[PDB]
């Protein structure tokens, strides 16, 4: 079958930019050197993160940049194409620091796609920078458009793949066209804001990358997995907000499609998205994080799962006191509460009291510190084996991580996912998925198909009585129903007719 | 101060008109003479039914009706005028016989309402008619306009209100306009069928008269009160339709406006329609029966209460076998399981072994027969204390009442109605409403009125938050709301400024 995408986003901070060098771990943790021609090969795509937009309203770089060494650094990822000729090197527009609604550029995400004019100077902005600076393609990540703005949003993305199409024809381009994508939320709570509208926002689209992550974290009560791929019972359930999504559903519509509490998942997370009629399998891409959360305060008795902590919740992280053991990351970024794979690993390996436990319902691995009361979320080589059977089985598009310079040095992550999707010595067919809790809600656009006798006018129906009529199977809600199915309040949609 | 209405109908059937007289009680059991002047003073209104819309999509009376006989019988409705200046004769078109979904005459309902050419034509002819017979105003009754067709039953409405004001003008009745009402659901599940749309309805009327009765019968499997004021918790409770009506709201919305299930009573229906904005309730009025429906094969423990029953609930009663002891009139019109008050007072004091019983939380009288296992489920001047004084403390428009005919001669329940409404020395300040369940959904139309801090533009909000924006107080549904109120669906609209 067609490859399974693998994209890697690629942040690098302003002032490391500026200060970029490749011999020197104290400025730049991870330089490009560190991917190799064999790393360049494992991947599809790598997101470099992130431009922004000015108050011109147009795509561009942090004023603060040195253009040139802005320049060199996007040299080096695209001379990575020299070994991979399917790699694209696509520019992220956004991030949580820019782009959230209290962000330093939030304002010009919304006033960009206000108009036909507006949207139109964006577009070009954005193929002007992409040639200018040697990119493949384009990834929205504005976290995130709400209501009112998403007609502007959508139309933005729609100019957007016009221009990039055209630039494709111009240069020639066909044998790898210029690209379009959008990082998309992975939760309800923010998936919700635009969630009616999610197959106009996809159409334009190669892929829209799900930020499946931060599912849990010190701002919530309750420690758990940030990236359960699958639920446990024993674990915290969540409000679900699609349930207000303006989606002018009934209520036992509304229901069915979102069960309430829920398991927030990377499952959930699909599911909901193929819920929506026009939303293709083949365009999602479920992110995983290359980082784990941490919370002190912790109970015993699980693991440090589940339990009350005393983790600060705030950015930035308000105090001087750096207690996740062992995480000299964590000192330098000023903040014990995230830590990256690599320095997770070493953790692991620096014999500092984490116990590396496993739960075998949400397919996801965890460290508990019994002497100090701590709990890490992260995911792992093995988490992957359960996430890349998941995209095979659910005919997804493949995979996409945050982010590149958290994987070990070795680039242990990365290499697993591809051999998940591509070894010809990997056989995961025996590979048991569990018996965590899958997401079950149905949408009145993904009906099963069902079988019932044609309504008959003239007849009174009584309560539960199911007919097939206008291409849908329909089920009274009461009885004495002498009524048609349609629009009526008596019928529910439940099926749809062969 | 102002008056309640008191809208009585009056049936009479074809044959009788047919063959009407006032000296024959075997063949007009209540001729218009019984409508004496005290009585006529007791009305405001009075619904003469029924008159139907006919093949050519206009009003008109059964084509089987003497018309020299109708006009005879309306001129005797009209001439009570002469007793009571702000008495009016409403004519009723439709009703369950003639306008339900497969009634006689339900296709002519239906494409009467379809057009602009059709709903002129409708309208033009239901004021005709009004004219030509002497009526005062129109009372559409079609049980009940489905979704697709409500749009076009709101434009009729709208017509006739436009030809009616203008008619009123031309002929000098600004002290008593012409009036146009209709007989609403007073159910959930009818009312589902029109219920987004309430406003629109409404605001051609001078009245939405709510059919608050019938919310149990024979074709329910459990007995239970068919015009219970409020719920009892040892009853049955019912799928609230409403929660299925094509609103757009959201699911806390609707599950707030909606719980299910609920209580099948007068009180829910009104909360029902109030929760809608644009529903005065000044336009609403409560239906009242002045009949019972009874039940046979009803078991014991609860005075035949929420009891199994055997009775059969096919139109027309589907036996020869009439069950309901000492129900004469029931062997006349060949159907034991619905009863006038005027026959059921009758029964009660016959020694034929019913016993009156009272149910304190739905404010109801019932009988029950222990001997034969029967139940009948009615109102009388008891229970009608009650309703008089949720109509006052609801400030609903009156009462209207199915029907005239089955008053007892003395016309009590009728003038019950209006010793609670008008009598000087009538008191009601000491009656106590009881814990019986009340409706308590919310809408659009009935925020409870509230304070809260304005909503600040940057600011971010936890879950359980409450605010002040645009007029209204807004609760938010989960945490870290960082956009505003009718902006971001975080936010619920719970109170009003």
Redesign the interface.
């Given at each position: 079958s067609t490859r399974k995408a693998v994209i890697g986003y690629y942040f690098i901070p302003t002032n490391q930019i500026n200060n970029y060098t490749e011999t020197d771990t104290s400025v730049v943790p991870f330089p490009v050197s560190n991917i190799t021609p064999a790393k360049a090969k494992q991947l599809t795509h790598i997101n470099f993160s992130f431009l922004d937009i000015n108050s011109n309203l147009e795509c561009a770089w942090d004023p603060a940049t040195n253009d040139a060494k802005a320049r060199d650094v996007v040299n080096r990822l695209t001379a990575l194409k020299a070994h991979n000729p399917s790699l694209r090197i696509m520019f992220s527009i956004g991030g949580w620091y820019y782009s959230?609604?209290?962000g330093v550029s939030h304002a010009n995400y919304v006033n960009a796609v206000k108009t036909p004019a507006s949207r139109a100077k964006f577009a070009q902005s954005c193929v002007r920078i992409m040639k200018d600076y040697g990119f493949d393609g384009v990834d929205i990540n504005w976290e995130y458009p709400?209501?009112?703005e998403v007609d502007g949003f959508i139309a933005a993305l729609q100019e957007i793949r016009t221009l990039l199409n055209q630039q494709t024809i111009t240069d020639g381009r066909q044998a790898l066209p210029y690209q379009l994508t959008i990082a998309g939320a992975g939760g309800a709570?923010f998936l919700?804001?635009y969630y009616s509208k999610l197959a106009q926002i996809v159409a334009p689209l190669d892929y829209i990358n799900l930020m499946t992550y931060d599912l849990a974290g010190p701002?919530e009560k309750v420690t758990n997995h940030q990236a359960a791929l699958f639920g446990d019972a024993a674990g915290p359930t969540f409000?679900n907000?699609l349930?207000?999504?303006?989606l002018?559903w009934?209520?036992?519509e509304?229901?069915r499609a979102?069960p309430?509490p829920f398991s927030l998942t990377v499952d959930a997370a699909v599911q909901q998205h193929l819920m929506m009629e026009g939303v293709p399998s083949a365009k999602i891409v479920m992110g995983v994080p290359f980082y784990g959360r941490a919370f002190k305060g912790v109970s015993g008795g699980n693991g440090g799962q589940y339990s009350s902590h005393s983790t600060p919740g705030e950015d930035p992280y308000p105090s001087t006191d750096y207690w996740l053991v062992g995480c000299e990351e964590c000192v330098r970024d000023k903040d014990p509460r995230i830590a990256s794979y690599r320095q997770l690993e070493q953790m692991l390996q620096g014999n500092y009291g984490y116990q590396r436990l496993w739960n075998d319902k949400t397919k996801t691995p965890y460290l508990y510190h019994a002497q100090n009361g701590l709990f890490v979320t992260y995911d792992d080589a093995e988490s992957f084996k359960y996430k890349a059977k998941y995209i095979k089985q659910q005919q997804l598009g493949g995979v996409m991580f945050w982010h590149l310079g958290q994987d070990n040095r070795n680039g242990d992550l990365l290499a697993a996912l591809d051999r998940y999707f591509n070894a010809a010595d990997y056989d995961d067919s025996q590979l048991d998925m569990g018996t965590g809790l899958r997401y079950t809600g149905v949408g009145p656009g993904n009906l099963p198909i069902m079988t019932a006798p044609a309504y008959v006018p003239?007849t009174?129906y009584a309560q539960g009585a199911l007919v097939s009529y206008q291409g849908y199977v329909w089920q009274t809600?009461?009885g004495?129903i002498?009524?048609a199915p349609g629009?009526?309040?008596?019928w529910?949609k439940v099926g749809r007719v062969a």
């Amino acid at each position: 079958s067609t490859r399974k995408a693998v994209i890697g986003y690629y942040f690098i901070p302003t002032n490391q930019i500026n200060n970029y060098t490749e011999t020197d771990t104290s400025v730049v943790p991870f330089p490009v050197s560190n991917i190799t021609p064999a790393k360049a090969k494992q991947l599809t795509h790598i997101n470099f993160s992130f431009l922004d937009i000015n108050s011109n309203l147009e795509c561009a770089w942090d004023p603060a940049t040195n253009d040139a060494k802005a320049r060199d650094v996007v040299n080096r990822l695209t001379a990575l194409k020299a070994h991979n000729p399917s790699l694209r090197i696509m520019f992220s527009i956004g991030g949580w620091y820019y782009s959230n609604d209290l962000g330093v550029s939030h304002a010009n995400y919304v006033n960009a796609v206000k108009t036909p004019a507006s949207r139109a100077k964006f577009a070009q902005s954005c193929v002007r920078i992409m040639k200018d600076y040697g990119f493949d393609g384009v990834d929205i990540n504005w976290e995130y458009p709400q209501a009112a703005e998403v007609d502007g949003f959508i139309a933005a993305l729609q100019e957007i793949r016009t221009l990039l199409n055209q630039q494709t024809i111009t240069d020639g381009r066909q044998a790898l066209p210029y690209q379009l994508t959008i990082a998309g939320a992975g939760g309800a709570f923010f998936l919700s804001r635009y969630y009616s509208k999610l197959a106009q926002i996809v159409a334009p689209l190669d892929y829209i990358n799900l930020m499946t992550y931060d599912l849990a974290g010190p701002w919530e009560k309750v420690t758990n997995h940030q990236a359960a791929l699958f639920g446990d019972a024993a674990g915290p359930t969540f409000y679900n907000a699609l349930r207000e999504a303006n989606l002018g559903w009934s209520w036992e519509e509304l229901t069915r499609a979102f069960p309430s509490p829920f398991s927030l998942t990377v499952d959930a997370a699909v599911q909901q998205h193929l819920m929506m009629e026009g939303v293709p399998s083949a365009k999602i891409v479920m992110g995983v994080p290359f980082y784990g959360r941490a919370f002190k305060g912790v109970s015993g008795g699980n693991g440090g799962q589940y339990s009350s902590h005393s983790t600060p919740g705030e950015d930035p992280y308000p105090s001087t006191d750096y207690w996740l053991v062992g995480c000299e990351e964590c000192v330098r970024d000023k903040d014990p509460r995230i830590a990256s794979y690599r320095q997770l690993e070493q953790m692991l390996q620096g014999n500092y009291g984490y116990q590396r436990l496993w739960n075998d319902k949400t397919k996801t691995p965890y460290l508990y510190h019994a002497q100090n009361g701590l709990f890490v979320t992260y995911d792992d080589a093995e988490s992957f084996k359960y996430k890349a059977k998941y995209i095979k089985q659910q005919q997804l598009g493949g995979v996409m991580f945050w982010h590149l310079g958290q994987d070990n040095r070795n680039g242990d992550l990365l290499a697993a996912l591809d051999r998940y999707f591509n070894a010809a010595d990997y056989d995961d067919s025996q590979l048991d998925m569990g018996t965590g809790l899958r997401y079950t809600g149905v949408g009145p656009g993904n009906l099963p198909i069902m079988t019932a006798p044609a309504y008959v006018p003239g007849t009174t129906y009584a309560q539960g009585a199911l007919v097939s009529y206008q291409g849908y199977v329909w089920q009274t809600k009461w009885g004495y129903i002498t009524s048609a199915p349609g629009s009526d309040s008596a019928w529910l949609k439940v099926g749809r007719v062969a």
